[PDB]
Ligand binder design. Structure first.
Ligand SMILES: Nc1ncnc2c1ncn2[C@@H]1O[C@H](COP(=O)(O)OP(=O)(O)O)[C@@H](O)[C@H]1O
Ligand SMILES: Nc1ncnc2c1ncn2[C@@H]1O[C@H](COP(=O)(O)OP(=O)(O)O)[C@@H](O)[C@H]1O
Ligand SMILES: Nc1ncnc2c1ncn2[C@@H]1O[C@H](COP(=O)(O)OP(=O)(O)O)[C@@H](O)[C@H]1O
Lengths: 525, 468, 540, 74, 72
């Protein structure tokens, strides 16, 4: 029975239950709504999107990646919340394919709606989809190719993959140069899998071509007054002390005086203690000093008299990457000047770019940190460029970890679709119908990928289907003229692990969402 | 006000397009210093061309690459037509400064200001062999009332805060002394309670505080200072009545509420290091003095003019006058625009006559290139040229003149050879404006063109807008 | 029996009976019982769809906006906006069945639903609830006797778990995790047998936590015989991997303890200030030397440490963590065999637990790592790590492993088991039909009511899948007449055979008898209650 | 209190209150009588077939109700 | 109304027209292969299109001779 047509509604105010078909209608309609809201960023012609803040903040951002929309969007449909959860999972896994897995899930749900309207049970659909996913995964691994051993081929595949990632973004104008720059940046880590080490800056104005890579480090903390402005070839030490009005941590201590003479004596004692601490710091043999918290007037005056620069407002990430790139060691007790390693740098300077004073590091010792200069007229294009660069770094790291790759741009999509169609016509029953709907969603993904360019779909899809039937498993759609051809020679390749992860995530999300039959609601607040 | 940078940065509409146009104007101001109005007008023209390009059922991605080709062609044309100058050609710098001042209220106050601006630039930066200009070298004193003739080229330091030491004026050969310790009773870092159980103890309290403050004054006079400057302290009283009286009894000028940000500028200029501890009262505080006069502007503002130092830094100051705040801001920003123009003259010494002539030439050349093209690209480049034709229309407008006739006459004069033909505002006609010294550098128009093209491309590939 | 009673006295004066009677719907008697039974009707029909492997999964959005997609009925209905006390009574019924067995919680609810289904028609015929309840109790006794008669038991002990693996796979077939049923059965049995007591004692579930992180693939779900620590090392250059580590239990911050009562210390002179400074410095020195005296590898701080302590630990190269929760401290102390340490007074190398292996685990570009502890020679705690494509499949895996481990615990408790999937339900229906045919007539209506009530389980199983219910019902009943077998029932997975035993489906007999008894008792109780008070003011 | 005036109407009100207080326990007399479950605040609904046990947990507010409950308690 | 490109169609058409002049060098709507209306027998009276152009011109002009509205 259903509570929709019942003598009583056992609910509080605002809580309701709806008929099974209506419940799935609402859930899957919310899911497909979020799906086509994230849609239209597929392919190299993906249109950008503004991430506006409805509140008084009014923070306006633009991005071509749909995951940014997913992380910052209001949630109404519970299935939409499930979709954003799985998409965030995929994004934390790999930096590309998040919008791909989201749109695949949205389609799978909309043809699930259509197929249930076609009088098919959800369990049969789930079984057919599981069979089709197994077939698609086996086909994808059959055509998967790894070329990590060959260093020249590995570098060429890195070129292709970074170009693939940047094609969907607006940076396609300098795609090749930014590609070689990012590949050099990722190889600068000497096989290190971390990505927070690579740091980026923002500078208003200038052409996009002005963007480049800095091998050293870029710093944007001001220098003191009395200390000399520029001293090179110094030793840099990182400290975790407050370095401001240092007082006894004992809570119960208090001062009880009968006259101002003892007050002045205590003030002089505090000044002498601060001077002793300053001398203890200077005992380390340091000229460029780095601090986290504030530095007051007396210590900065003492540093200026000592001719030693103190750098404040160095946050945890900044000191982290500075230690990674120079080998400096963080310290909190300065009673052992020789027991803490000091940072080694070749050249330090305070460059003047734009209308700001930026400290630039050159000749870093360890080199385990990359600093990238990005130039843009507006902050929006700047953040879009940095997000695209970060996604490129993520996909490059994923390729470095495993070099198993496949031919994308609809090519491997046609492989999967062909395998699933072959199995569907091989098998009888409504499971075949469900998994053929799976296959048609698979085919319609690159359909809209290409149609985002205002091109034709059916002719190219049929041509690629026929060519891959002939055995042209390396044939893929070319965005340059909206035509077909050898996908590899276009220099556009996709990692096999990313494709497999996207396929599995979409399959599992569709399976878990489809099993929902009825929606029950508690009392809203 | 007139110049559009402040106008855009002041008003706000909250629509993302408006905010990013404001950001584009700010970036244009940052990169070059002027042309913000020009670049935003160019963006608006490209967008009115774009909407018509869009109603024709054209994909908004091929038009982006067409705009990129138009941009690179226009950059090539502008670079080709521009003529280089020399860093020793003061005449070219004077022409550029005068042209910059024309678009401001002080347009007729240019013959005395352009040499002023170039001399200030020469003083505050490297006279030659330099790449960047530090705009922070020169500060501005904005004063109500007065005239442009009342503006000065002071090269010392001015303290806008009031003289808390009333009755002390014109300390001859004044020695400027900056201190950071607050002139008040001593206080420990930790909380103290002054418990008093006897009359003698309470008397000793203030007796000892008076003795300590007198010792402080004596140690201040140990070096022989006659002018004292205190920081801006709000937790503790920077200047107390007892300290002020003790310093006035023996003639030291006292001024409090001094910002900590100006301390770095003072150190860069003269080098009087701030002092936080009394024991470090060395002899490096002071130096030679030339002039310290408390000038008054007919009672319409109190100022402390202290000019003249021995071996100062490369920093000067400007005192901008004006009846109302708007004209003061206009004169100040006119001076700033002149300085930015000289900065643009520092690098990429490529000059071209302005006044619509570069835009007329660009429109004609892009029309030719569109004719040479084919496909949607030719139509997009035609729309591009029609859009960029707007600037000579606006310049021909604001005077009631015919834009069509002006544009066609300029195009014909370019065709016969006279490319440098512009709009002559003084003669109210159309002729070459090279004689009128209406010349602009390369990296102002080039920067505006590139920025406008990038912004229109950014907003070109937009599908929908959503809120969070 | 609505909007109060209309009398208006009897000489024309205004009349008052009950407070707020202008709109009070006064509910007593048979109509009140109708209201309660129909509310239970709604609850049961909304809940019953989660029965059988083909049974779908309900979702709920709680008062806090958190979703929950679930297959196990107990947790499906455990968070319902229950208003009438009968629904709450069914909730405690489900809870009692769940903590008594763990599986079959759906069975009691559906059985009670069908019992009330025919009870309401019996009430419409004009039958007072007492005789209905008595007949229902007689019927429950008959059903329990049949269940005892058709029992069959096998070996369950720790040495052999192949029947346990089959039972776990059968139980998890109804859950979406049925893709890798063999893998989850094997890992679950390994987890439960890692630490267990076979002398009819409880297995420490405090030490067995089902926790995992999102990401990866479902088949990556693997068993970690140890402890999972969320926190990470504070220093960048600090080493991330330590082997053969010793756990230093710490329950005090790395700062000088302060007096509990309010205290005042008078520092007046320069000598006092310097003396306090040097006292504090020597206190830090004493504390750091005391910490280093034990020589432990890993130090676990509940209250953390400051920057100076962090640098001192860095120089000493002694791995340590900060701000760890108390229950986690108890778990790690039990697993490593550590001892309670109040402060540095009782800190020594003889009271340190041992961790076999300690590692930092990375999951790509997240900047958020975790600490895994395993390989302990005396590990008293074992945890199962589950991977999934999203957090809600993770939660479903959590509850699926929970139910599987509960089934394993029930099997360990006793080997008395039977065959489910409606076959035993059909046998019970046959027994109740026989009792109706061989017992006094007046209560035979309640007899056959209870029979039709027990008949709903194959009803729901069939209509969940989609086969024709009643033809299968009659055919299986006829075959069961031909041969007595609790293994002739519905082929939900369409395997083509009605031999339920051949399909390796095992459920505990204690669970089924408790299900029947609990359902009968709850139905009897609800039959005898006809009082609920409502104000019904229809506030605006 | 509706028509709670001096004389007979207040007696009628008391009689009606007595009838209402009887209705709650009217159905639990005997060993085979039905039981009562009524919400009592925090949901600790109590099963008790004894009528007096029902009486200790009632919500009597009418004076007639109280002056009958006291006799019942005695 | 169908979907072919406007501008390459224009380019091909006037290229063929400057190569040779014919009143039937237009659009191949139904993919007859050639842009020659003579082969496809696309025929319309000259008077109709003459009056088309004339009426359009005159009424466009006389609409251009209107610039006032005073809605109450
Ligand atoms: N040159 C190309 N030709 C065809 N398809 C491409 C090309 N470059 C990228 N793609 C596809 O377009 C998709 C869009 O990628 P992107 O928007 O960066 O993130 P997501 O993959 O999550 O959508 C990619 O998944 C990729 O498979
Ligand atoms: N005497 C003049 N005759 C004609 N045009 C002039 C004259 N003086 C200046 N202009 C034009 O006015 C424009 C002012 O530009 P700009 O200073 O960028 O405007 P804004 O200060 O509002 O940003 C210059 O591009 C120049 O071509
Ligand atoms: N393979 C199967 N075929 C037919 N029926 C099954 C099968 N597996 C389980 N069942 C039945 O489905 C019922 C529901 O089991 P399940 O949903 O796993 O937990 P619960 O019993 O708590 O609802 C069980 O009582 C069992 O008898």
């Amino acid at each position: 029975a259903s509570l929709s047509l019942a003598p009583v509604n056992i609910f509080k105010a605002g809580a309701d239950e709806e008929r099974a078909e209506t419940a799935r209608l609402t859930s899957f309609i919310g899911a497909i709504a979020i799906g086509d809201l994230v849609k239209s960023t597929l392919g190299p012609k993906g249109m950008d999107k503004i991430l506006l803040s409805s509140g008084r903040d009014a923070s306006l951002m633009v991005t071509n990646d749909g995951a940014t929309i997913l992380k910052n969007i209001g949630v109404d449909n519970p299935a939409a919340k499930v979709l954003v959860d799985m998409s965030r999972v995929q994004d934390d896994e790999v930096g590309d394919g998040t919008t791909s897995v989201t749109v695949l899930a949205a389609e799978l749900l909309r043809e699930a709606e259509s197929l249930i309207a076609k009088k098919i049970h959800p369990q049969t659909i789930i079984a057919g989809w599981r069979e089709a996913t197994k077939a698609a995964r086996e086909a994808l691994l059959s055509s998967a190719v790894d070329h990590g051993s060959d260093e020249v081929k590995f570098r060429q595949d890195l070129m292709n993959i970074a170009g693939t990632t940047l094609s969907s973004k607006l940076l396609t104008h300098h795609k090749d140069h930014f590609t070689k720059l990012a590949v050099e940046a990722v190889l600068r880590l000497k096989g290190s899998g971390n990505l927070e080490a690579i740091h980026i800056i923002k500078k208003l104005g200038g052409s996009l071509a002005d963007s480049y890579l800095d091998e050293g480090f870029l710093l944007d903390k001001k220098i003191g007054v009395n200390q000399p402005k520029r001293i090179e070839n110094a030793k840099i030490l990182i400290a975790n002390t407050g370095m401001d009005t240092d007082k006894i941590k004992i809570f119960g201590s208090r001062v009880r005086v009968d006259s101002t003479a003892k007050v002045a004596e205590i003030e002089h004692a505090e000044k002498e203690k601060m001077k002793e601490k300053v001398e203890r710091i200077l005992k380390h043999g340091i000229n460029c000093f780095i601090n986290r918290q504030l530095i007051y007037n007396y210590p900065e005056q003492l540093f200026g008299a000592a001719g030693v620069m103190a750098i404040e407002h160095a946050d945890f990430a900044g000191v982290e990457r500075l230690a990674l790139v120079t080998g400096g060691e963080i310290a909190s007790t300065f009673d052992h000047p020789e027991l803490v390693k000091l940072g080694s740098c070749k050249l330090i300077e305070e460059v003047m770019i734009g209308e700001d004073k930026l400290i630039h590091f050159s000749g870093v010792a360890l080199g385990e940190a990359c600093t990238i200069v990005l130039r843009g007229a507006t902050q929006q294009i700047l953040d879009e460029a940095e997000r695209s660069l970060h996604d490129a770094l993520c996909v490059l790291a994923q390729t470095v970890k495993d070099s198993r790759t496949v031919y994308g741009g609809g090519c491997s999509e046609m492989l999967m679709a062909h395998a699933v169609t072959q199995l569907a016509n091989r098998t009888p029953g409504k499971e075949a119908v469900a998994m053929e709907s799976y296959a048609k969603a698979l085919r319609m993904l690159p359909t809209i990928i290409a149609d985002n360019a205002g091109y034709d779909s059916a002719d190219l899809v049929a041509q690629l289907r026929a060519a891959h039937s002939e055995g042209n498993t390396t044939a893929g759609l070319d965005m340059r003229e909206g035509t077909i051809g050898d996908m590899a020679i276009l220099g556009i390749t996709e990692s096999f692990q990313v494709k497999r992860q996207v396929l599995l995530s979409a399959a599992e999300a569709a399976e878990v969402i489809l099993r929902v039959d009825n929606i029950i609601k508690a009392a809203p607040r | 006000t007139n110049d559009g940078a402040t106008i855009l940065k002041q008003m706000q509409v909250l629509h993302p397009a408006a905010r990013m146009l404001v950001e584009l104007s700010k970036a244009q101001d940052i990169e070059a210093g002027d042309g913000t109005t020009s670049v935003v007008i160019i963006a608006g023209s490209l967008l009115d061309s774009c909407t018509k390009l869009l109603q024709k059922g054209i994909h908004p991605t091929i038009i982006s690459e067409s705009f990129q080709k138009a941009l690179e062609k226009g950059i090539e044309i502008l670079t080709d037509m521009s003529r280089p100058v020399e860093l020793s050609d003061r005449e070219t710098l004077l022409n550029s400064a005068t042209t910059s001042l024309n678009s401001k209220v002080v347009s007729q106050y240019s013959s005395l200001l352009s040499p002023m601006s170039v001399n200030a630039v020469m003083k505050v930066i490297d006279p030659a062999t330099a790449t960047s200009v530090d705009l922070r070298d020169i500060k501005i004193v904005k004063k109500l009332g007065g005239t442009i003739d009342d503006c000065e080229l002071v090269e010392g330091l001015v303290l806008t805060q009031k003289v808390s030491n009333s009755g002390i004026t014109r300390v001859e050969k004044a020695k400027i002394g900056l201190i950071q310790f607050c002139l008040s009773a001593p206080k420990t870092d930790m909380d103290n309670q002054i418990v008093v159980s006897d009359y003698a103890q309470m008397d000793r309290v203030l007796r000892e505080e008076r003795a300590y403050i007198l010792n402080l004054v004596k140690q201040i006079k140990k070096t022989g200072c006659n002018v004292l400057l205190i920081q801006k302290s709000i937790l503790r009283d920077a200047l107390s009545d007892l300290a002020l009286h003790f310093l006035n009894k023996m003639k030291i000028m006292v001024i409090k509420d001094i910002e900590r940000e100006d301390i770095e500028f003072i150190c860069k200029t003269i080098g009087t290091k701030p002092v936080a501890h009394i024991d470090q009262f060395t002899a490096d505080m002071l130096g030679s003095a030339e002039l310290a006069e408390e000038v008054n502007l007919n009672g319409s503002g109190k100022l402390l003019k202290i000019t003249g130092c021995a071996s100062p830094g490369k920093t000067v100051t400007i005192v901008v006058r004006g009846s109302n705040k708007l004209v003061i801001e206009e004169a100040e920003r006119s001076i700033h625009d002149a300085l930015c123009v000289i900065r643009c003259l520092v690098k990429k010494r490529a000059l071209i006559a302005g006044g619509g002539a570069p835009e007329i030439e660009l429109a004609l050349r892009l029309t030719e290139y569109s004719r040479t093209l084919s496909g949607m690209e030719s139509y997009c480049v035609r729309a591009f040229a029609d859009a960029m034709e707007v600037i000579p229309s606006t310049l021909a407008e604001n005077a009631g003149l015919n834009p069509i006739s002006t544009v066609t006459e300029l195009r014909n004069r370019h065709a016969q050879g006279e490319k440098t033909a512009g709009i002559n505002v003084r003669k109210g006609g159309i002729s070459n404006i090279l004689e009128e010294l209406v010349v602009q550098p390369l990296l102002v128009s080039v920067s505006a063109l590139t920025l406008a093209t990038e912004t229109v491309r950014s907003i070109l590939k937009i599908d929908d807008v959503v809120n969070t | 029996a609505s909007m109060g009673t209309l009398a208006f006295d009897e000489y024309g004066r205004p009349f008052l009976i009950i407070k707020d009677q202008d709109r009070k719907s006064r509910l007593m008697g048979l109509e009140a019982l109708k209201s309660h039974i129909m509310a239970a009707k709604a609850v049961a029909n909304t809940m019953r769809t989660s029965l059988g492997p083909n049974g779908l999964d309900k979702m709920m959005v709680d008062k806090d906006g958190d979703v929950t997609v679930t297959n196990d009925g107990a947790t499906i209905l455990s968070m319902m906006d229950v208003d009438h006390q009968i629904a709450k009574l069914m909730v405690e019924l489900s809870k009692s069945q769940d903590d008594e067995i763990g599986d079959g919680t759906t069975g009691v609810v559906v059985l009670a639903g069908a019992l009330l289904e025919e009870a309401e028609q019996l009430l419409d015929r004009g039958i007072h609830p007492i005789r209905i309840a008595d007949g229902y109790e007689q019927a429950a006794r008959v059903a329990i006797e049949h269940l005892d008669k058709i029992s069959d038991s096998v070996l369950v002990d720790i040495k052999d778990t192949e029947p346990l693996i089959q039972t776990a796979k059968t139980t998890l077939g109804s859950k979406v995790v049925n893709s890798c049923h063999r893998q989850m059965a094997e890992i679950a049995v390994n987890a439960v047998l890692t630490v267990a007591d076979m002398e009819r004692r409880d297995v420490d579930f405090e030490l067995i936590k089902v926790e995992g992180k999102v990401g990866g693939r479902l088949e990556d779900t693997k068993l970690i015989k140890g402890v999972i620590v969320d926190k990470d090392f504070s220093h960048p250059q600090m080493p991330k991997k330590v082997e053969d580590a010793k756990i230093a239990i710490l329950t005090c911050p790395f700062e000088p303890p302060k007096p509990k009562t309010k205290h005042k210390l008078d520092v007046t002179s320069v000598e006092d200030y310097k003396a306090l400074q040097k006292y504090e410095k020597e206190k830090f020195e004493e504390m750091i030397q005391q910490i280093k005296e034990t020589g432990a590898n890993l130090a676990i701080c509940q209250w953390g440490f400051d920057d100076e302590a962090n640098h001192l630990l860095l120089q000493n190269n002694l791995p340590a963590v900060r701000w760890v929760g108390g229950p986690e401290i108890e778990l790690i102390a039990i697993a490593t065999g550590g001892r309670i340490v109040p402060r540095f007074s009782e800190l020594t190398a003889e009271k340190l637990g041992f961790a076999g292996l300690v590692q930092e685990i990375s999951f790509g570009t997240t900047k958020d790592k975790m600490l895994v502890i395993e390989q302990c020679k005396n590990s008293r705690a074992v945890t199962i790590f589950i991977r999934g494509g999203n957090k809600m499949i993770i939660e479903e895996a959590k509850r699926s492993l929970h139910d599987a481990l509960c089934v394993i615990r029930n099997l360990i408790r006793d080997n008395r088991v039977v065959y489910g999937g409606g076959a035993a339900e059909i046998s019970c229906a046959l027994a109740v039909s026989q009792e109706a045919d061989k017992c006094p007539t007046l209560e035979q209506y309640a007899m056959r009511a209870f029979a039709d009530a027990l008949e709903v389980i194959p009803m729901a199983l069939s209509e969940n899948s989609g086969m024709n219910p009643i033809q299968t019902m009659t055919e299986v009943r006829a075959r069961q007449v031909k041969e007595m077998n609790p293994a002739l029932g519905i082929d939900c997975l369409h395997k083509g055979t009605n031999d339920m035993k051949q399909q390796h489906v095992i459920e505990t007999l204690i669970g089924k008898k408790q299900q029947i008894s609990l359902a009968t008792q709850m139905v009897r109780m609800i039959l005898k209650i006809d009082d609920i008070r409502k104000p019904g003011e229809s506030e605006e | 209190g509706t028509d709670s005036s001096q004389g007979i109407p207040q007696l009628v009100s008391n009689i009606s209150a007595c009838q209402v207080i009887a209705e709650a326990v009217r159905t639990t007399l005997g060993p085979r009588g039905m039981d009562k479950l009524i919400v009592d605040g925090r949901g600790k609904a109590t099963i008790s077939n004894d009528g007096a046990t029902i009486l200790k947990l009632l919500d009597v507010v009418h004076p007639a109700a109280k002056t009958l409950v006291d006799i019942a308690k005695s």
